[PDB]
Design a protein around this ligand. Structure first.
Ligand SMILES: [Mg+2]
Ligand SMILES: [Zn+2]
Ligand SMILES: [Zn+2]
Ligand SMILES: [Zn+2]
Lengths: 162, 84, 100, 263, 113, 47, 133, 774, 250, 66
């Protein structure tokens, strides 16, 4: 905004540098250290924090999605980046990040490394609470999702009021 | 212990789509199993239509037990949940 | 000249003189058996030519003249095959006008 | 009020012109002559023996497409309406074909003239296959080598082209109107000039060309149709026209009777 | 396998009627006629015959599906004339026109052939 | 027969008799035992 | 019976990209500052440049389902050559006396610019336009 | 292979086909499939006669029944029961009847990328052996009719029938949560048809109008007045299309800043379901957001939206049947002058490329920063050739006539584009392999027909001829190379996209929205304290502008500030009935000052915190403009009637409405803080729209209209909340993986995989460094 | 015999299926009375840039009128203009357009129609060879699930993506019935102490016993997929003990 | 196989003109001239007769199966 308050286009000069070195470049005098950005969110986690990592991850995913003009609602990407950065560290979408969670063994074995997860569960005497959807599906029960996220009682009072 | 008092209920007073579908299916099955009908039947023969008519007049005798993540539950009557 | 109908040959003006040692018999010979059935393949898109080459194996017709004395697991014979009205010169060597 | 003008006439085809009629009437007449004029065609083939290279269904389909004389097919009765079991003499025509090659050399060509009308609803003039001339060989049916025999018994019944195209009495009906596009019922695709790039219709000389200074007539309607009917020889062109008119009249009479009985 | 029989295109089943008539209460003097085992050949002819009648205020027809041999006609006349009388008048007029056309065609064929 | 694995498979195929052109195309077929988009491209030397 | 009536001299006729619709722009002879632009059918009403059209805008033709008119009865449209019916979709009350009225006849657009004393009665939901020459 | 997925009974699979005469939520089922599949219906007093008739018909005749289940569970086979004509059914028995009409069935195409690939349809029993589908549901299924096979599943219980009818129904899936825009629209011929229907020079005679009006299932039986009365009645196509549009729908769109005159017949104005002006095309009846389909859906309901689909399809299909449309070879042929222009442009480009080659060979070409000389030369040549191809295509497109069929298809948006016309008529263009020109496969040459070290365009994959003119053998080979590269790229991309989608789905599989508004996994760990930080469904948001953010300070002050002390700056006396007792008041002035201070605080909060870049068009719930215009249309706010709505009433009503937008309910301080944080943006938007000056002057509402607007806003906001129990994790995973199928730094599928895998080594590391202002 | 659903393709990659069949009197006709044997949508032309299809149609029309076979050899001197001149010399429109009439009403079509002979071939993809349906039939010996194969009266597969779509839809009951009642449902007995599936049950004489825990009263029954039973049995065979408990210990 | 009885498009009988067509082609007449002399006006019948291939002779060349 200008003096009158109207938004106007302004042209400034910035630098685009190949290679990653965050802290040293931020410490360089004459550089706006409050706005320096990196495309490697691992470096952002190492330097800035976890919330900045979430912001940078969302920015990268949005750039990848919207480079070709496609539009995806903000809530889906927000949920993805919240899941990825919910334990204080980056959780990769693979067997090295998903299977390391404290979820049930039945739902973890269904993704990858079924026999290894089952053997580890047998050796560690793990207990499955059957609160997820995968182990409810494999056991042929009503999963606690959608219409199964509650129970239907009988209205004795209204029937008596007849 | 796990029950929540009627004056302390914090869930929404509206009927969700999943709750509506579950109540409609249960009422249709019960009507098909020779259950008493709380509304008049003029020309409709489909139990689903009878269940929908009962839901519109708020006469379905069922209670929704909404489960909080901790384990506590709230009981909402079908006659007090707002239906769009 | 300045003909607006025929295609434009490359200029080939990067060399003052040309010394050819060989000449192609015909460029259309660079195609395969299945691609020789396509009429005017140079006016099409290459994925369409690939699709036609792939689907040429699914068309039915008189594969042999002794199908009556053969015992094959499957066989499809058209009652009235017809030779195409638009044809390529290679079809004469593919026996397409005789077993369409 | 309706008027008919015949330009050309012959037993195979009639090129005529209709005027002072609605477009729907001419279109309905064309459709009725195309699909709703009953004729006689082979609908049942009994193969006693077939040693030819052609398949049994191949020969049956070829036999079903052979036109037959249907001059007195109106007096014939439908198979459904007939109360007899299977088929009888007054609801079907029986044809017999027997072909064999004599000698160990050469190929014997079996045509449609080899069919013999053994029995039919006498003395109606139906059943006999159509011959272009007295010495015409006919439609080529099959070819036989040595020790190859064909023995077919065919049953011909009365039907319309709606059930199958083999009962169609006519081949193609040319139909057009307004050769000069006075009514502007179509828009002419063009690159430079529409008048030069589009060939004139064969009836363009019959109607006066539009003057360049003429104004569009919004109240004009199509009132002059030129139509050519070509038959397959089963029925004459005049017979096809008359029977199409009669079929349309019978359909309208049936609708009127249903309306009267609905009260 | 699932192909319907061809003769069902023109053979009317005994349990169904050829003609059905239902009044239309949206506007006065309007009826809906269901024609069974028919097609455009009769429908277009009847529609354009009825459209030229001064006492007919609305006439239309439609074939719901090409796979089913039936069509639906909507007919509305003025207060003086009932739609059924207009339909019978149209049928009689087309019959008379066809008779005249056949007579003149026969006369022309006799005069020159 | 003993060494079912570690051997080339699909060398011999049932001849196609759907049509004459398909039979000729099957009789004039080449394959590479590689099962990387580098070898799948149309090289200039394929002219 | 007629909300508005005037005589317009045609200045501009634009066929555009349509083979049947022409846009005509003209002004009233008896008073300036009244500009009429209107889309018309070429075949139904062929007009040329520098013509004189009597244009009347009315609310009803009397002297809900549409039906063909019988020859017996009479209406105001019997006195004119081109008749169209449409919906008013804008009544712009701009600066000073400059007032524009926008009417769409089934997609054929017409804009009439004038003063309040001449276009005050045209503020309706539906209109009939009649052109005579 | 046996627990997560398995083979199931009561399923069918067959080839699909199109059917314009079907509703949106209807599927045609063959006779044999309907007879083979069955549904068990219980025996009650409401359907005893129908079930007995079905049993008497038998399993070989449709409608009929296959098995009869007794009370104890014993099954009677009607195939072997030859005395079924005198059997009586008892209450509580089950009859396995055939598939009848209006039976909900799940209908699926594989692969199932998103939830719209598996929807509930209504059965219509039809002859022949192909499934029949409406043309508007092909795009969500991603199916065509070149041999596709699709699957059908039959529920066998009343509860699952109700679940399919109320959750997975086709009309309920018109709007998708992935991009809050419809996924079903008018496509293919119908689309083209309406472009030929709503033209300004389209007129219809009376009989065709009657036929088309009768063809509308939802017609009210009233014939509209023709646009032309004398000398012959005539109806335009706009009226016939507006007949299909339900009343009460308002839509406005501008194209290139067009005025209300609309000389080019662009834009769109629909008032009360009638099209004032604007050619209807993909911009209106397409799948884009804010169009006719989205507005009709959000205004009326899924049932009315499906009815609109059917009505438009039927009317346009009949008009195209009785009008006709075609394409031909002559549509790809340009006149001599345009061909001469194209050849001149190509020759000039070739001369420029020769000049560039001469400059590069003499060390005269300017070196691009961070690039090699050869790379810079190749980039310059590629840019010149691309510009030449674009210019030739532009000339060819400008030459095209209005009657050209390809131009008609492109303008309708049904099929084709600019590049297709350019390649068919003017020039195919430069062929690129792996982002570069054709490499030298031979010894320093692309083909043995060229000399060594040849850098002319024709020697490196430039096709200067069009498809109509044909291709030279070298151009043919280069085009084949490019096509093979494209096919290989697509083939390798599909598998990676599928694996990424599966990994995402497994990662976000067990995420659900609970009844307290939080988003938790199966362990109970909270991922988000509120879904999407606002607790709103993805299908209930539309792009709206916040009027407080843009504009200068003077414009803001003029639009919002009200001064009762000064006559000029006060409310105009002719719009309010209380203009006498309003000058000099102190309480009303204090209330207006408080409102202005709240507006200024909202402006500061929006500009300095949330949107620092000045963007104001964002997805928000409850379209306020539609509500305002609906109230204006309903209450007839014309005739410049003086409003009887006092300023304190407006201020108190807005204040009460802003406090009644409940997302989280409770008296806890944290709950109140979360509610305020969640509803801050919507409160800002509402305060921007419902300003005292704007209400009194711009909109001119009264007491009834104001109350109706407040009630409608409250009800719509209550209806726009996300329903608890929603499986948001799987929805997010599918909505992220779906665009991946369609699609100097690393970008695309490799970049997405690199992000998801959290690679310690980055293919193209980079830093963006911002300097100080000076 | 060709019917609705049969697959037909041209020589330029323009494959498709029959949608509907019209009789002779319903198809559009030209002034000469010629009706097409096949009608295709123009919308398939500009997307695939199959100019060769239209050129072949024009050449076939010219050759049919003149009475020979056209030469369609690539890289020749033949141009579209020469074929257009040949067609114009034969009394037809140079670009192949023809004035056609509507079959239903007989009225002229406003737009002229590209009309001419073209080579088409029938593919080995027939709807009657692909239609499949199953209510109940044979099941696998091992998993007690429906067999695979259309000929063997097999069952369609409800894969993982279908399960994901059902989870997104929120229909838990439909998924449960599809994966249990429409598949290998089974009833097992478990012991309330060991939790293992080692309970010996005799329903004829109503005797339930657990050898390990000497239990005869605290025994429950469960409805589970047969594949789940097989998985649990295999886990027991691999010295792993998955114990199913119907109550939460807490 | 053998010449079809009727034209596929219109339905004109073309099964009786094969011998005449072969006789005309034997005496040096051009294909177009022979088709014109066979009174085949519409090009549907022209392509029915011109593009037909006679495969019946090849099958007849084989020895009889019985
Ligand atoms: Mg497909
Ligand atoms: Zn009999
Ligand atoms: Zn135990
Ligand atoms: Zn023919």
């Amino acid at each position: 905004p200008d003096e009158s308050g109207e938004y106007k286009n302004e042209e400034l000069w910035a630098l685009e540098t190949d290679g990653i070195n965050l802290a040293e470049v931020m410490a360089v005098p004459g550089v706006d250290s409050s706005r320096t950005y990196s495309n490697s969110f691992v470096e952002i986690l190492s330097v800035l924090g976890i919330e900045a990592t979430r912001s940078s991850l969302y920015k990268e995913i949005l750039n990848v999605i919207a480079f070709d003009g496609s539009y995806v609602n903000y809530r889906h990407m927000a949920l993805l980046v919240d899941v990825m950065t919910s334990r204080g560290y980056l959780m990769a979408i693979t067997r090295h990040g998903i299977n390391r969670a404290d979820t049930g063994a039945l739902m973890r074995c269904s993704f990858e490394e079924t026999v290894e997860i089952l053997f580890e569960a047998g050796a560690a005497a793990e207990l499955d609470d059957c609160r997820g959807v995968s182990e409810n599906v494999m056991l042929g029960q009503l999963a606690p999702m959608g219409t199964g996220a509650f129970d239907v009682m009988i209205d004795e009072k209204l029937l008596t009021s007849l | 212990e796990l029950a929540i008092l009627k004056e302390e209920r914090t869930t929404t007073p509206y009927l969700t789509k999943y709750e509506r579908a579950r109540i409609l299916g249960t009422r249709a099955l019960q009507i098909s199993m020779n259950a008493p009908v709380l509304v008049d039947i003029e020309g409709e023969t489909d139990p689903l239509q009878i269940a929908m008519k009962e839901l519109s007049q708020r006469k379905i005798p069922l209670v929704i037990r909404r489960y909080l993540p901790d384990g506590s539950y709230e009981d909402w009557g079908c006659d007090e949940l707002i239906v769009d | 000249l300045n003909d607006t109908a025929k295609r434009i040959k490359p200029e080939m003006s990067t060399s003052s003189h040309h010394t050819f040692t060989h000449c192609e018999i015909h460029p259309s010979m660079i195609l395969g058996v299945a691609a020789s059935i396509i009429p005017f393949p140079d006016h099409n898109q290459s994925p369409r030519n690939t699709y036609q080459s792939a689907m040429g194996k699914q068309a039915m017709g008189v594969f042999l003249t002794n199908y009556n004395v053969r015992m094959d697991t499957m066989a499809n014979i058209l009652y009235y095959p017809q030779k195409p009205l638009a044809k390529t010169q290679a079809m004469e060597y593919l026996k397409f006008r005789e077993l369409p | 009020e309706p008027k008919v003008n015949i330009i050309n006439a012959q037993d195979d085809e009639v090129e005529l012109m209709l005027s002072d009629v609605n477009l729907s009437l001419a279109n309905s007449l064309r459709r009725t002559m195309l699909a709703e004029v009953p004729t006689l065609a082979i609908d049942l083939v009994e193969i006693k023996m077939n040693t030819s290279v052609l398949a049994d269904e191949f020969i049956s389909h070829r036999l079903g497409l052979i036109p037959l004389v249907s001059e007195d097919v109106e007096e014939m009765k439908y198979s459904r309406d007939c109360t007899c079991e299977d088929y009888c003499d007054e609801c079907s025509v029986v044809l017999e074909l027997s072909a064999r090659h004599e000698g160990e050399e050469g190929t014997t060509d079996v045509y449609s003239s080899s069919l013999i009308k053994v029995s039919g609803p006498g003395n109606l003039n139906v059943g006999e296959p159509v011959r272009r001339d007295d010495y015409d060989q006919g439609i080529l049916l099959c070819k036989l080598r040595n020790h190859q025999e064909l023995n077919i018994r065919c049953i011909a019944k009365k039907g319309i082209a709606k059930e199958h195209a083999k009962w169609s009495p006519c081949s193609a009906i040319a139909f057009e109107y307004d050769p000069h596009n006075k009514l502007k019922h179509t828009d002419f695709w063009f690159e430079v000039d529409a008048k030069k790039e589009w060939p004139d219709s064969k009836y363009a000389t019959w109607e006066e060309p539009p003057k360049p200074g003429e104004v569009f007539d919004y109240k004009a309607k199509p009132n002059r149709f030129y139509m050519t009917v070509e038959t397959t020889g089963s029925l004459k062109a005049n017979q096809v026209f008359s029977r199409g008119i009669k079929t349309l009249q019978e359909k309208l009479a049936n609708v009127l009777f249903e309306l009267e009985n609905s009260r | 396998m699932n192909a319907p029989d061809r003769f069902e295109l023109f053979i009317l089943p005994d349990d169904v009627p050829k003609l059905k008539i239902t009044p239309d209460s949206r506007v006065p003097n309007c009826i809906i006629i269901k024609f069974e085992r028919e097609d455009h050949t009769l429908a277009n002819l009847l529609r354009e015959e009825l459209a030229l009648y001064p006492d007919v205020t609305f006439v239309a027809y439609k074939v719901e599906h090409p796979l089913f041999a039936n069509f639906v006609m909507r007919l509305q006349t003025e207060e003086g004339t009932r739609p059924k009388q207009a339909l019978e008048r149209a049928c009689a007029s087309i019959i008379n026109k066809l008779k005249t056309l056949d007579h003149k065609f026969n006369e022309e064929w006799n005069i020159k052939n | 027969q003993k060494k079912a694995m570690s051997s080339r498979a699909g060398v011999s195929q049932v001849l196609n008799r759907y049509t004459y052109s398909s039979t000729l195309s099957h009789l004039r077929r080449t394959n590479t035992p590689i099962g990387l988009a580098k070898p799948r491209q149309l090289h200039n030397t394929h002219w | 019976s007629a909300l508005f009536d005037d005589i317009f001299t045609v200045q501009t006729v634009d066929n555009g990209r349509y083979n049947k619709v022409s846009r005509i722009i003209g002004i009233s002879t008896t008073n300036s500052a009244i500009k009429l632009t209107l889309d018309i059918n070429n075949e139904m009403f062929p007009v040329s440049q520098d013509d004189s059209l009597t244009v009347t805008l009315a609310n009803s033709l009397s002297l809900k389902s549409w039906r063909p008119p019988k020859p017996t009865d009479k209406s105001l449209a019997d006195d004119y050559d081109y008749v169209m019916f449409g919906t008013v979709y804008k009544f712009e009350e701009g600066d000073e006396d400059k007032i524009k009225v926008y009417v769409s006849f089934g997609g054929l657009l017409m804009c009439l610019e004038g003063g309040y004393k001449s276009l005050a009665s045209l503020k309706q939901d539906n209109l009939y336009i009649l052109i005579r020459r | 292979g046996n627990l997560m997925g398995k083979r199931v009974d009561f399923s069918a699979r067959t080839v699909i086909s199109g059917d314009p005469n079907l509703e949106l939520d209807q599927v045609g089922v063959p006779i044999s499939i309907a007879k083979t599949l069955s549904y068990p219906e219980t025996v009650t007093q409401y359907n005893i006669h129908r079930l007995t008739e079905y049993v008497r018909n038998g399993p070989n005749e449709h409608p009929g029944a296959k098995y009869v289940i007794r009370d104890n569970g014993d099954r009677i086979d009607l195939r072997y029961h030859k005395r079924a004509g005198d059997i009586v059914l008892q209450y509580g028995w089950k009859v396995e009847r055939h598939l009848m009409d209006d039976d909900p069935v799940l209908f699926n195409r594989q692969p199932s990328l998103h939830k719209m690939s598996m929807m509930a349809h209504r059965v219509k029993v039809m002859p022949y052996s192909t499934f029949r589908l409406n043309l508007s549901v092909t795009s969500p299924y991603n199916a065509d009719f070149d041999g596709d096979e699709m699957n059908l599943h039959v529920p066998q219980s009343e509860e699952t029938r109700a679940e399919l009818s109320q959750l997975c129904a086709v009309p309920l899936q018109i709007v998708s949560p992935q991009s809050n825009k419809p996924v079903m629209g008018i496509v293919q011929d119908t689309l083209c048809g309406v472009r030929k229907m709503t033209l300004r020079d389209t007129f219809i005679e009376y009989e065709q109008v009657m036929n088309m009006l009768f063809w509308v299932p939802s017609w009210d039986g009233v014939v509209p007045q023709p646009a032309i009365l004398k000398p012959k009645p005539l109806w335009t196509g706009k009226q016939l299309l507006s007949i299909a549009i339900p009343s009460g729908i308002h839509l406005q769109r501008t194209d290139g800043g067009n005025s209300l005159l609309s000389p080019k017949d662009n834009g769109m104005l629909i008032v009360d379901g009638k099209v004032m002006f604007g050619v209807v095309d993909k911009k209106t009846v397409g799948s884009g957001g804010g169009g006719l389909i989205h507005t009709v859906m959000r205004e009326k309901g899924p049932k009315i939206c499906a009815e609109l689909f059917g009505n438009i399809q039927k009317v346009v299909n009949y008009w195209l049947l009785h009008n006709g449309f075609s394409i031909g070879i002559g549509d790809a042929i340009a006149d001599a002058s345009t061909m001469k222009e194209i050849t001149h442009a190509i020759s000039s480009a070739k001369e420029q490329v020769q000049e560039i080659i001469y400059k590069a060979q003499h060390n005269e070409l300017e070196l691009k920063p961070g690039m090699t000389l050869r790379e810079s030369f190749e980039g310059e040549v590629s840019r010149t050739l691309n510009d030449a191809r674009d210019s030739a295509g532009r000339s060819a497109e400008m030459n095209l006539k209005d009657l050209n069929n390809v131009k008609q298809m492109v303008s309708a948006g049904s099929k084709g584009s600019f590049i297709n016309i350019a390649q068919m008529s003017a020039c195919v263009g430069q062929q690129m392999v792996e982002g570069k020109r054709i490499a030298f496969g031979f010894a320093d040459r692309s083909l043995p027909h060229f000399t060594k070290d040849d850098f002319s365009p024709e020697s490196k994959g430039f096709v200067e001829n069009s498809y109509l003119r044909g291709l030279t053998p070298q151009e043919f080979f280069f085009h084949a190379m490019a096509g093979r590269e494209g096919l290989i790229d697509t083939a390798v991309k599909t598998a990676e996209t599928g694996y990424i989608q599966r990994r995402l789905v497994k990662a976000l599989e067990d995420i659900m929205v609970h009844y307290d508004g939080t988003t938790r996994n199966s362990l109970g760990d909270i991922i988000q304290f509120l879904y999407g930080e606002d607790g709103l469904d993805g299908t209930q948001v539309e792009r709206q502008t916040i009027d407080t953010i843009p504009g200068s300070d003077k414009a803001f002050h003029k639009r919002y500030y009200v001064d009762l002390m000064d006559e000029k700056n006060s409310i105009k006396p002719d719009v309010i009935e209380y203009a006498a007792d309003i000058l000099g008041d102190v309480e009303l002035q204090k209330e207006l000052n408080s409102e202005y201070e709240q507006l200024v605080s909202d402006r500061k909060f929006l500009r300095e915190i949330v949107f620092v870049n000045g963007d104001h068009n964002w997805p928000l719930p409850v379209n306020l403009r539609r509500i305002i215009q609906n109230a204006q249309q309903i209450f007839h706010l014309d005739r410049a009637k003086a409003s009887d709505l006092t300023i304190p009433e407006i201020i108190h009503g807005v204040r009460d409405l802003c406090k009644k937008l409940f997302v989280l309910r409770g008296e806890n301080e944290l709950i109140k803080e979360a509610q305020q944080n969640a509803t801050s943006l919507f409160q800002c938007l509402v305060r921007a729209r419902l300003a005292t000056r704007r209400i009194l002057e711009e909109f001119r509402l009264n007491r009834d209209a104001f109350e109706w607007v407040l009630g409608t806003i409250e009800a719509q906001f209550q209806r726009s909340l996300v329903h608890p129990g929603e499986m948001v994790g799987v929805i997010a995973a599918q909505s992220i993986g779906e665009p991946a199928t369609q699609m100097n730094v690393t970008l695309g599928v490799p970049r997405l995989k690199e992000i998801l895998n959290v690679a310690k080594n980055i293919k193209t590391p980079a830093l963006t460094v911002y300097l100080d202002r000076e | 015999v060709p019917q609705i659903g049969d697959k037909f393709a041209s020589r330029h990659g323009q494959k498709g299926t029959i949608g509907v069949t019209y009789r002779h009197e319903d198809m559009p006709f030209s002034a000469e009375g010629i009706v097409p044997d096949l009608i295709i949508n123009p919308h398939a032309i500009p997307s695939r840039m199959t100019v060769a299809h239209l050129i072949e149609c024009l050449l076939s029309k010219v050759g049919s009128i003149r009475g020979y076979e056209g030469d369609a050899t690539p890289f020749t001197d033949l141009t579209v203009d020469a074929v257009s001149n040949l067609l114009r010399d034969n009394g037809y429109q140079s670009r192949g357009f023809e004035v056609m009439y509507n079959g239903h009403t007989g009225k002229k079509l406003m737009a002229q129609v590209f009309f001419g002979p073209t080579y088409y071939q029938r593919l080995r993809h027939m709807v009657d060879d692909k239609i499949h349906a199953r209510a109940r039939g044979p099941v696998q010996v091992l998993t007690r699930q429906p067999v695979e194969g259309r000929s063997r009266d097999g069952g369609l597969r409800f894969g993982e993506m279908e399960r994901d779509c059902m989870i997104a839809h929120g229909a838990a009951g439909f998924l449960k019935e599809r994966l249990m009642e429409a598949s290998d449902a089974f009833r097992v007995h478990v012991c309330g102490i060991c939790g293992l599936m080692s309970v010996i049950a005799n329903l004829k004489k109503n005797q339930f016993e657990c050898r390990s825990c000497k239990n005869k009263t605290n025994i429950y029954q469960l409805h589970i997929p047969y594949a789940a039973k097989l998985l649990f049995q295999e886990l027991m065979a691999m010295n792993i003990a998955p114990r199913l408990y119907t109550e939460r210990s807490g | 196989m053998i010449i079809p009885v009727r034209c596929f498009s219109c339905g004109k009988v073309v099964g009786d003109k094969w011998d005449a067509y072969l006789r005309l082609l034997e005496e040096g007449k051009q294909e177009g001239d022979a088709l014109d002399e066979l009174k085949l006006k519409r090009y549907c019948c022209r392509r029915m007769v011109l593009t037909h291939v006679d495969l019946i002779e090849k099958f007849l060349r084989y020895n009889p199966l019985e």
